[PDB]
Design an enzyme around this catalytic site. Sequence first.
Site, PDB file in Angstrom:
ATOM      1  N   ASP A 128      -5.795  -5.214  -4.935  1.00 29.71           N
ATOM      2  CA  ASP A 128      -4.860  -6.034  -5.713  1.00 29.71           C
ATOM      3  C   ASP A 128      -5.381  -6.221  -7.121  1.00 29.71           C
ATOM      4  O   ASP A 128      -5.893  -7.304  -7.496  1.00 29.71           O
ATOM      5  CB  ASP A 128      -4.706  -7.379  -5.048  1.00 29.71           C
ATOM      6  CG  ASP A 128      -3.921  -7.302  -3.718  1.00 29.71           C
ATOM      7  OD1 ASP A 128      -3.438  -6.199  -3.293  1.00 29.71           O
ATOM      8  OD2 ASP A 128      -3.792  -8.385  -3.098  1.00 29.71           O
ATOM      9  N   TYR A 150       7.969 -11.303  -7.397  1.00 31.35           N
ATOM     10  CA  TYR A 150       7.976 -12.775  -7.558  1.00 31.35           C
ATOM     11  C   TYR A 150       7.195 -13.065  -8.830  1.00 31.35           C
ATOM     12  O   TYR A 150       6.680 -12.146  -9.478  1.00 31.35           O
ATOM     13  CB  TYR A 150       7.451 -13.554  -6.318  1.00 31.35           C
ATOM     14  CG  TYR A 150       6.225 -12.892  -5.690  1.00 31.35           C
ATOM     15  CD1 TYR A 150       4.991 -12.951  -6.331  1.00 31.35           C
ATOM     16  CD2 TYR A 150       6.326 -12.227  -4.491  1.00 31.35           C
ATOM     17  CE1 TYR A 150       3.821 -12.353  -5.752  1.00 31.35           C
ATOM     18  CE2 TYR A 150       5.173 -11.579  -3.943  1.00 31.35           C
ATOM     19  CZ  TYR A 150       3.958 -11.676  -4.567  1.00 31.35           C
ATOM     20  OH  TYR A 150       2.825 -11.072  -3.996  1.00 31.35           O
ATOM     21  N   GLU A 203      -4.889  -6.916 -10.789  1.00 29.62           N
ATOM     22  CA  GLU A 203      -3.849  -7.505 -11.665  1.00 29.62           C
ATOM     23  C   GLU A 203      -4.405  -7.485 -13.076  1.00 29.62           C
ATOM     24  O   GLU A 203      -5.157  -8.413 -13.469  1.00 29.62           O
ATOM     25  CB  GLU A 203      -3.533  -8.952 -11.208  1.00 29.62           C
ATOM     26  CG  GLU A 203      -2.929  -8.882  -9.773  1.00 29.62           C
ATOM     27  CD  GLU A 203      -2.495 -10.214  -9.200  1.00 29.62           C
ATOM     28  OE1 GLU A 203      -2.067 -11.071  -9.997  1.00 29.62           O
ATOM     29  OE2 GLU A 203      -2.563 -10.396  -7.955  1.00 29.62           O
ATOM     30  N   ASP A 256      -6.861  -3.422   0.981  1.00 27.30           N
ATOM     31  CA  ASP A 256      -5.711  -3.648   0.083  1.00 27.30           C
ATOM     32  C   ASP A 256      -6.335  -3.905  -1.280  1.00 27.30           C
ATOM     33  O   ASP A 256      -7.241  -4.737  -1.392  1.00 27.30           O
ATOM     34  CB  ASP A 256      -4.910  -4.841   0.558  1.00 27.30           C
ATOM     35  CG  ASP A 256      -3.814  -5.236  -0.398  1.00 27.30           C
ATOM     36  OD1 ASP A 256      -2.958  -4.385  -0.798  1.00 27.30           O
ATOM     37  OD2 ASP A 256      -3.735  -6.453  -0.737  1.00 27.30           O
TER      38      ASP A 256
END
Length: 567
Positions: A292, A370, A294, A290
């Site tokens: 991720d 979120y 950012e 995965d």
Amino acid sequence: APTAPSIDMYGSNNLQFSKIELAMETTSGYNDMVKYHELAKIKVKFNQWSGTSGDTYNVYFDGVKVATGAITGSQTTASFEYGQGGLYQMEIEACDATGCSKSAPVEITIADTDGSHLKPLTMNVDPNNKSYNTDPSIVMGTYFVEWGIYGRDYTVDNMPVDNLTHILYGFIPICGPNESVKSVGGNSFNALQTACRGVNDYEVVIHDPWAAYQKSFPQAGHEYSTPIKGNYAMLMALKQRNPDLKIIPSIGGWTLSDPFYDFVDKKNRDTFVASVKKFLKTWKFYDGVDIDWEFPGGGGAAADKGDPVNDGPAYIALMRELRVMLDELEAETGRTYELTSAIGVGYDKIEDVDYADAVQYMDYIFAMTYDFYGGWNNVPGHQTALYCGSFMRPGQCDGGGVDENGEPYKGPAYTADNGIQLLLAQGVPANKLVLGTAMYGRGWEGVTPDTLTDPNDPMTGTATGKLKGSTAQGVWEDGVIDYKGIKSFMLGANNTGINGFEYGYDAQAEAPWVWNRSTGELITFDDHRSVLAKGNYAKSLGLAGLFSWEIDADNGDILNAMHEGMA
Ligand SMILES: S=C=Nc1ccc2oc(C3=NCCN3)cc2c1
Ligand SMILES: S=C=Nc1ccc2oc(C3=NCCN3)cc2c1
């Protein structure tokens, strides 16, 4: 008729052997601490103190001869190599001219990182987590964080694994520029710097070897000579209990994203991809990767980083290269490996990547629906709302309006639906999108009744600062509180509010809040109602399912709602 051999345990390392050699008493660079061997070295000592010892020995595992050699007097060491992990019944036979004699059997452990030597983990799950018969094609994911085993005291055996299809393990760092990690603390940065000694930049490593494989968890039966311990040994035993569960390492996150910005250079991507392939061959219980990052384009923890021209094409190229590497693994192992990514869903994050291009290489995108609002500033808002709420100004939902100072909005408001619609508008297929749920609140203090522009809505107020509280209440960092702490100290058993809080719910946004009008404390979070709404939305659009962040913060209510929402 030699005397039957007797096994010397202590000299045979308690019959604990391993394909992977892991440092247990020290901390150093990753390549110093972790060495995976294709063959385990087995060394078993036995003795024959009475009668005659004979001339040759044979070693049997489950009745199959695996080694042979010379008997050496009254004590003998059988050394041999073995390639298959497992738990075996071993017997040692001594032979001469006049016959052979076998030892009593004894269990030998040959560790490997698929958990083939482990019994299924014994679970200790909070019984508020209920049982459901959700269709097995629906993603029900959560993130488990490596550091949840310290203060939060939440271990792998506490996870409601029968209610999950994917466990994302957070977070695997990449060696190289990682100044953002100093915002977490100097020990955490120092741990990374230690792990990266002797490691090339852009390769992955384990951030916390103590939590990952050294720490003994008595609940998992771990002991001194246990060859693999820590969370990793627990995840291996969990895979034995739940062989259909996907456990995927998540690379990156908020504070570990800084090296990804160097992936505009292909050579750095090559280094990274090869390193991931080597990590997955080393730790075989993992089922994929995965990413991720950012965020491509910037907007993450490092204010100085981000290239909105080149980051999105680098991201697509990275996913393509990862998928090629994982197809190589699939061919070598016969297994399926999944490639997934968690992505920002603000319009400004989505505009920086063509996800329709990247997603053809991926199994799932985990949409980070979120953290839309939070204690980094004094503007309350719904952090995980589905639709535009009541607090938003005219023209704010779509972006064409002006704020209260007269500055134009630059894009559509941060809501989960605005994000999902933008990704669908790019061409991302619904059935690859997984919608996110927060198992925590973000909060402010000082939002008092006189700051509100609409007296029924505290999200139209203004804060003076971040929510504060103790770890007993689930506040591990100012501004953030675990869902289980909101439930125990702010909602109470009737869900109507306790300790001076009142519960509210924006039925348009689909977003709950709790507000203490005396302290001005205001917390925005996800609850049973808003998660049922997210599940209904995911059903109606044919999304892949739901995931949550982070599982230690739930008391079962949020994961139960996720199942009920998808029923
Ligand atoms: S975001 C971030 N969250 C983090 C990241 C790393 C961490 O390490 C600890 C810890 N405290 C004492 C020993 N380990 C807490 C903690 C929180
Ligand atoms: S782990 C993680 N923790 C997070 C996750 C998301 C976040 O967003 C901000 C933020 N700061 C200014 C505008 N946005 C901080 C922040 C910390």
